[PDB]
Amino acid sequence: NQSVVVDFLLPTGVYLNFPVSRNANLSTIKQLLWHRAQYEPLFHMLSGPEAYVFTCINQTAEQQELEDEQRRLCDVQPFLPVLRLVAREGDRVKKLINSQISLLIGKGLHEFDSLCDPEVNDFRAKMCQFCEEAAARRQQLGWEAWLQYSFPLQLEPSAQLPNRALLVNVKFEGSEESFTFQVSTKDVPLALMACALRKKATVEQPEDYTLQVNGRHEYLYGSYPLCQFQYICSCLHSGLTPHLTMVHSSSILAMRDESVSLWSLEQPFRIELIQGSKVNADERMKLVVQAGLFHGNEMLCKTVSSSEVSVCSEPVWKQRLEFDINICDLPRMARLCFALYAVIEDCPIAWANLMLFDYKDQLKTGERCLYMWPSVPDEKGELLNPTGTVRSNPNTDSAAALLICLPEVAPHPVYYPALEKILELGRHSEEEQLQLREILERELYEHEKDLVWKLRHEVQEHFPEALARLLLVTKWNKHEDVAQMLYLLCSWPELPVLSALELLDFSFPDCHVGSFAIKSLRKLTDDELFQYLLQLVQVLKYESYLDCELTKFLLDRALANRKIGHFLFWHLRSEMHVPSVALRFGLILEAYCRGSTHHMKVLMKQGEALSKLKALNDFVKLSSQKTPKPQTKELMHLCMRQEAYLEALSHLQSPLDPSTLLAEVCVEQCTFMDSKMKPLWIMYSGSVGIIFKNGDDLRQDMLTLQMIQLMDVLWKQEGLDLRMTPYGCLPTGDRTGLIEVVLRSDTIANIQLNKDALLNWLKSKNPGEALDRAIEEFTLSCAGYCVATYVLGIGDRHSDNIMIRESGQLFHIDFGHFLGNERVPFILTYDFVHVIQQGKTNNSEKFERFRGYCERAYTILRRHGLLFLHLFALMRAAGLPELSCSKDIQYLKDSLALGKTEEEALKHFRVKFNEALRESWK
Amino acid sequence: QQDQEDNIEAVGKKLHEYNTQFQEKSREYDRLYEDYTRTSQEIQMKRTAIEAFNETIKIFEEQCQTQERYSKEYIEKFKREGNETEIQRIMHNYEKLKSRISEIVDSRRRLEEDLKKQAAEYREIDKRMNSIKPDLIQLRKTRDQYLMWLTQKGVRQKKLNEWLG
């Protein structure tokens, strides 16, 4: 309803209770409070209104000082309507930030304290310190550098070409008087600035300014020609005049401102299996606990099983399980893995894994209570689950568990040996080159593995790119070998990005390997790193410890580049509902936020917009089932026009592109579809829109779209622009995300209503001399999307999920299925071929041009095929249904024909092309 | 020596049947797993809401403590001033504060009871899943054995497709 009864606790002990309006701000509520307090006991002892701040318990069960008194009570969302007056004391900045973080990242910061965990505490202390420090350094930097941090250049793939004189609209900040004048495509932005001043000087130095794309936080600066900037490149193709505004440096500063050894212990590894708790199994059956040590994929020794105790909730074993390996042999990242089974005198109940050494390198001893995760029955059907996370299940109150006890190894605590000790032990140790060449130059076999091990020094000298192979042959259950491999690894030459990406896979768990990988990933530019950001984040789910190199790397780049930080934030935020990552991601977000107080503001606004949309979408759903679309559409609009809603949906930076300002909502233009999940279509006033979806997971679409974007870049890097439309797609929450609407477009189905409709529609949108452009845009884009969809194995392609733009560009949407989900053939559509051929039965010149486009596109992707396989291999981490296993990866090997030669592959593509053309008529 | 079957159509018929049973049993398991996840999410939400009650109650009990220490002085004052008017107001106001605590405590209790019931549901969901898993895995294996037998027999992929689909 409107009013809500609010409890007020005064600092004298007095208690007041009265109704206030839900949408009233806290400042107003203080006035109402003071007005009523004067008529209650002990008033005269109070200081003035302004000497106190309200305090509430917020949704995440934390106390919050409500410093911003312009906030509305309904927006504050206290647990119960209870407000307490306290002093304006202590480090309020620290108090304010801590509370905002909790609201922003999902998880209350207190939830981290509640775990009573040194690893958590050390992470927070060390990472928050580093992130705050980076932030403080950043504040000291100059307006140019801060602009670079905040709004990095969006350049075309040319960077990291013809000359024409074209017009630019230039104005100043504050003044309506604009200037239109010609400047060349090869002029640097500093030169264009100088012209605008010389115009102003007729009626301040040119270096005391920057150029803004007005309407947007996208700026033109640096040592690059105009045509390499995306905004100009976009305008050039379209033939439109770019509109710039010259901003003074001061204005940029304004927004800136506001003991025993391990190898000595030759004792076989053992544990006490004490007890299980909270088992929910079949009473008729019996219970067994399976165990095994692991290092990545490989077993360190054979597995061992418990006795068949009967099925009860609280089973008891008290057995020693001894393993076929000594404590001196255990590798650093040795991983003890359990699985609880229900066998009939075979159901996998649940599993749980545990690192033997802790985060400070100490060999663990004593009791341990592993809260288990339930086993998902899948195709592979393995005994244990070594790939699973080491983190315990956070549902400690309801989840099944096993109580175990690591025995005391020694009277003193024992650590895994230091690097100096590793390099000491690791130091000591025509014909053969033939066998090794063959093996490498081109899954190994026992004979081959021992050769590679013998010739491991030859691999380092002459086949440095084979490190991954040599790491897999190494016998990680023998401490001598491990030391020898690590010796080589420390002297190993820097490998390229592509190699480093492979080494981040879960097959390579050793911390020195991860360290070598990241060390090779540091040469990444921000643009390229951005292409792989999603994969790098999913690899965090393979890490053993919270404090790792990869997290540090990601936070470093997130702190130096605000675009990276933006998307890092949303990748982590979108999975905070997922139990197995909530802790790790929570901690990274906290640290990110402390180094990024400016962006926190932006992200807060976005988060509030998104929470209103969820509520808006839920209101639409409940209305749609009762009343028809017209009536529901208008009810949507009324719910939007409310002050709390409208303000929260208005005036925000877009999550899809933080440079885009979503200013005024066009409520009349907003709508939805009565489909699965009732997605909302939200329009803004340069008239951008977004789709809000709630109900589906959008992660697969984003992966697909990211791979098409990567394709586009790869093609664009070798002179080929296939005029793609890789529209933004961003998971934000639990089965929630946004899609960037593409304007001036329609679905092929809708346009098709001889059926020369496509060409007529094009004609109607590109009359006269514009049509040859439109057809060329269709041809280039149809080629690109024909290849993309073939390579990624995207089927279900129909008139509803393929769209065309008024420019002529074709593009695909709603990529629900890929990688065969059977081989998807290359597909040519008669109606597209017709349009390509300019409405003629035969147009050999044009059609061969189109065929070449397809072939060139495909040839380029093959060149970078290893990149696609590696990126897809890291996405196995994400647990997407259609990217589970080696067979899904193998789909890409075959589609790109990587075991075939370039000529062979192209001849097969041709055959497939031709057969698609034959199939086109049938 | 190598120790480790009727006509093709009859094996193929059983392949269609077992595959249908596998898809039906899989969708059942998928249903329960959606409940398992939802219930798991609801349970944490409730557990966080209990902490929120605990925290709210805490601040009220600080208010109570503050009321006692603080009032002490002023109660004494208007006693030696026949201002039992004001004493009465302070005490009555304090009795209202205590009374509101009892409402909050009762609400916390009602939720603890709900979380107890939903904790029982979680365990029941997890039980039913674990009685469905053996049927599910057995049906997957049987389905796969029938395919393998037919594939060895040289049965065409199109015939196998129509039995599976």
Ligand SMILES: NC(=O)c1nc(-c2cccc(O)c2)nc2c1[nH]c(=O)n2CCc1ccc(Cl)c(Cl)c1
């Ligand atoms: N980028 C887009 O402009 C876009 N995108 C998706 C799309 C859908 C799913 C996954 C995805 O990756 C993309 N669908 C689109 C669309 N434009 C469009 O007319 N449709 C179809 C009809 C429709 C969809 C949603 C709503 Cl709310 C409404 Cl009212 C109508």
